[PDB]
Amino acid sequence: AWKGEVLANNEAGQVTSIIYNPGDVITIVAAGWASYGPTQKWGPQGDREHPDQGLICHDAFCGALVMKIGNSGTIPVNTGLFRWVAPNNVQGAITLIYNDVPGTYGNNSGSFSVNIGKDQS
Amino acid sequence: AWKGEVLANNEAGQVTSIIYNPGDVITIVAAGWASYGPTQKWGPQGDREHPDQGLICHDAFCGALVMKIGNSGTIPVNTGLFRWVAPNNVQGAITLIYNDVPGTYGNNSGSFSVNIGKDQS
Amino acid sequence: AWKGEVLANNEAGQVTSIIYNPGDVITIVAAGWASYGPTQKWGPQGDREHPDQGLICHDAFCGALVMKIGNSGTIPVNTGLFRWVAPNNVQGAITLIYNDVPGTYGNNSGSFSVNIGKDQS
Amino acid sequence: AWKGEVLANNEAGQVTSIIYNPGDVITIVAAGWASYGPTQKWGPQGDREHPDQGLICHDAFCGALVMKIGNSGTIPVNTGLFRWVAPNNVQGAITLIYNDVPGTYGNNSGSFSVNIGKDQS
Numbered sequence: 001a002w003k004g005e006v007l008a009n010n011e012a013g014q015v016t017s018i019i020y021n022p023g024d025v026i027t028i029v030a031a032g033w034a035s036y037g038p039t040q041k042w043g044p045q046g047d048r049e050h051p052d053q054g055l056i057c058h059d060a061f062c063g064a065l066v067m068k069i070g071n072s073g074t075i076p077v078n079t080g081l082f083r084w085v086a087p088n089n090v091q092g093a094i095t096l097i098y099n100d101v102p103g104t105y106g107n108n109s110g111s112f113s114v115n116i117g118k119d120q121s
Numbered sequence: 122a123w124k125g126e127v128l129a130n131n132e133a134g135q136v137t138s139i140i141y142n143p144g145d146v147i148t149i150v151a152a153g154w155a156s157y158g159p160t161q162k163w164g165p166q167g168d169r170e171h172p173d174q175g176l177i178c179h180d181a182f183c184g185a186l187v188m189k190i191g192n193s194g195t196i197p198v199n200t201g202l203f204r205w206v207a208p209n210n211v212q213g214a215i216t217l218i219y220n221d222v223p224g225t226y227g228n229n230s231g232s233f234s235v236n237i238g239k240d241q242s
Numbered sequence: 243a244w245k246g247e248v249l250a251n252n253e254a255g256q257v258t259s260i261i262y263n264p265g266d267v268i269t270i271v272a273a274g275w276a277s278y279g280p281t282q283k284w285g286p287q288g289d290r291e292h293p294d295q296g297l298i299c300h301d302a303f304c305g306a307l308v309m310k311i312g313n314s315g316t317i318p319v320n321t322g323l324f325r326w327v328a329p330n331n332v333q334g335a336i337t338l339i340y341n342d343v344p345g346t347y348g349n350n351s352g353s354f355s356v357n358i359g360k361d362q363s
Numbered sequence: 364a365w366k367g368e369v370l371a372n373n374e375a376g377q378v379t380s381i382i383y384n385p386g387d388v389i390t391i392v393a394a395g396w397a398s399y400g401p402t403q404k405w406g407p408q409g410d411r412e413h414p415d416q417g418l419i420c421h422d423a424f425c426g427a428l429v430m431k432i433g434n435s436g437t438i439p440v441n442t443g444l445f446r447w448v449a450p451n452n453v454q455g456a457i458t459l460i461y462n463d464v465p466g467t468y469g470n471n472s473g474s475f476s477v478n479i480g481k482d483q484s
C-alpha cells in the first residue's frame with residue numbers, strides 16, 4: 001500500500017508508488033482539512049458552494065481531492081474509492097492533486113492524509 | 122461486504138450486515154452531504170466550526186459519521202478507516218450513526234453512502 | 243494468517259491460530275511429502291491406490307490433509323482450498339490433521355507445510 | 364481471478380487470463396491427478412522417484428505443475444503459491460504447463476484444476 005500526504009498548494013500534485021494496471025481493484029481513503037484561499041477549510045469533497053472558474057477537474061468541487069492515472073484526465077477521488085476499477089482504459093502511476101484553478105495554488109493551505117491499497121482480484 | 126445509506130435524521134442509526142470479530146481488519150469509505158439543521162451541508166467529517174452541544178460522540182464534529190460495534194460507545198468514522206483493527210475488546214454488529222445531539226435529529230437532512238468490507242488478514 | 247507444520251505422526255493434528263467465524267472466506271495452501279508407513283511418500287492428496295481401512299476422513303485418501311473447524315467432523319483439504327466458505331453454522335478453531343487410521347499413526351513420517359489466510363469479504 | 368484445467372497431454376500449456384505485473388502478490392491452488400505415461404497418477408508435485416530425462420522444468424519433478432510468466436523460463440508451481448511475488452524483471456501472461464520431456468506429451472493423461480487470484484497489497 002501507499003500512505004502519504006497531498007499539500008493543497010502543490011499544483012503538480014503528489015506522485016504515489018501505486019501503478020494502476022488493467023483489472024486492478026483499489027481502495028483509497030482520504031481525510032483532513034484544506035483551503036483554496038479563504039479562511040474556512042473543507043474536507044476532501046471540497047466546497048459545494050464555490051463556482052468552477054476553470055478547475056483542473058470539472059467533475060469535482062473546488063478544494064476536492066482528485067487524481068491522474070498515467071496520462072489520464074483528472075478523476076474525482078473525494079473521500080475515497082471502495083474496491084474501484086478504472087471505468088476507462090487508464091494505466092500508470094497514480095498522482096493525487098488538490099482541485100484548484102491553474103496558476104492559483106499559491107494561496108492554498110492545509111493537506112489531506114491519503115491511503116491507497118490494491119484489493120484482491 | 123455491506124453498502125448502504127446512513128440518513129442524517131435516523132437517530133437509532135443504520136445497522137449493517139457486518140459482525141466485527143476479534144482480529145478482523147476492516148475498511149470503511151463514506152461519502153455524501155448532510156446537515157444537522159442549517160441550510161449548509163457537510164461531508165462525513167461534519168462541521169469543524171460547530172460547538173459540541175451534547176453530541177452522541179464528543180470525539181467527532183457535529184454532522185460527522187460515527188459507529189458502534191455491538192454495545193461499544195460511539196467511535197469516530199469520518200471519511201472512513203483503512204485496514205483498521207479494533208483497539209478495544211469489541212464484537213458484534215457495526216451500527217453507523219450521524220453525530221448530532223439526542224432529540225435534535227428531526228430537522229436533519231441528507232445521508233452518507235457507506236461501504237464496509239473485511240480485508241485480507 | 244497462520245503458517246506451520248502438520249506432522250504425519252501427530253494423531254491429534256495441529257491446532258492453528260485461525261478462528262473460522264461465520265461469513266469468513268479463507269485460502270489454504272499445503273505442500274510437502276509424508277507417509278502413513280511405507281518407504282514411499284505422497285503429497286497432500288494422499289495415496290489414491292490405498293484402501294480405506296477406517297480413516298478419520300472417508301472423503302479423502304489415506305495420507306491426505308484434512309481439517310476440523312471447531313466441533314465439526316473431518317473436512318478434506320488436500321492441496322488446499324481457494325477463497326472457501328464453510329458450511330452454514332460451522333465455526334471455531336481450525337485443526338489440521340493427517341488422514342490415517344486411528345492407532346496407526348506411530349509409523350508415519352514427514353509433514354505438510356501449510357498456510358492459512360483470511361481473504362477479503 | 365482465473366480458474367481452469369491444465370491438461371497433461373497439452374505440450375504448449377494452458378494460457379490463463381492472469382497478467383502478472385510488477386508488485387503483484389498472487390495465490391495459486393492446484394489439485395488433481397495426472398500421468399506422464401504410466402498407469403499410476405500423481406498430483407501437482409509430480410513423481411519424486413522419476414529421473415529428469417530433459418524436462419521443461421529442471422527445478423520440479425516429472426508430472427509436476429509448472430508455469431511461465433511472459434518470456435520467463437519455467438518456474439515450479441507444485442501444489443501452488445501463497446501470497447507470492449515473482450522475481451524482478453519477470454512479468455506478463457501466466458501459462459500453466461504439465462512438466463514432461465518435449466515431444467513426449469502424447470501418452471499423458473489427466474489434468475490439474477487450478478485457481479489463480481491476485482492478493483491485497
Ligand SMILES: COc1ccc(C(=O)c2cc(OC)c(OC)c(OC)c2)cc1S[C@@H]1O[C@H](CO)[C@H](O)[C@H](O)[C@H]1O
Nearest residue numbers: 036037038050051052053062100101104105106107108
Ligand atoms: C472568499 O473566496 C472567494 C470568493 C469569491 C471568489 C471569486 O472569484 C468569485 C468571482 C465572481 O465573479 C467574478 C463570482 O460571481 C459573481 C463569484 O461567485 C461566488 C466568486 C473567489 C474566492 S477564493 C479564490 O478561488 C479561486 C478558485 O475559484 C482560486 O483558488 C483563488 O486562489 C482563491 O483565492
Ligand SMILES: COc1ccc(C(=O)c2cc(OC)c(OC)c(OC)c2)cc1S[C@@H]1O[C@H](CO)[C@H](O)[C@H](O)[C@H]1O
Nearest residue numbers: 278279280291292293294295304342343346347349350
Ligand atoms: C506397504 O504398506 C501397506 C501395504 C498393505 C496394507 C494393507 O493393509 C492392505 C490390505 C488390503 O486388503 C486386505 C489391500 O487390498 C486392496 C491393500 O491394497 C493396497 C492394502 C497396508 C500398508 S501400510 C499401513 O496402512 C495402514 C492404513 O491403511 C496404517 O497406516 C498402517 O500404519 C500402515 O502400516
Ligand SMILES: COc1ccc(C(=O)c2cc(OC)c(OC)c(OC)c2)cc1S[C@@H]1O[C@H](CO)[C@H](O)[C@H](O)[C@H]1O
Nearest residue numbers: 399400401413414415416425463464467468469470471
Ligand atoms: C524412463 O521413463 C520410462 C521408461 C520406460 C517406460 C515403459 O513403458 C516400460 C515398458 C516396459 O515394457 C516394454 C517395461 O518393462 C517392465 C518397463 O519397466 C519399467 C517400463 C515408461 C517410462 S515413463 C516415460 O517418461 C518420460 C519422461 O521421463 C516420458 O514422459 C514418456 O512419455 C514416458 O513414457
Ligand SMILES: [Ca+2]
Nearest residue numbers: 036037104105
Ligand atoms: Ca487558490
Ligand SMILES: [Ca+2]
Nearest residue numbers: 157158225226
Ligand atoms: Ca439537528
Ligand SMILES: [Ca+2]
Nearest residue numbers: 278279346347
Ligand atoms: Ca500409519
Ligand SMILES: [Ca+2]
Nearest residue numbers: 399400467468
Ligand atoms: Ca509422457
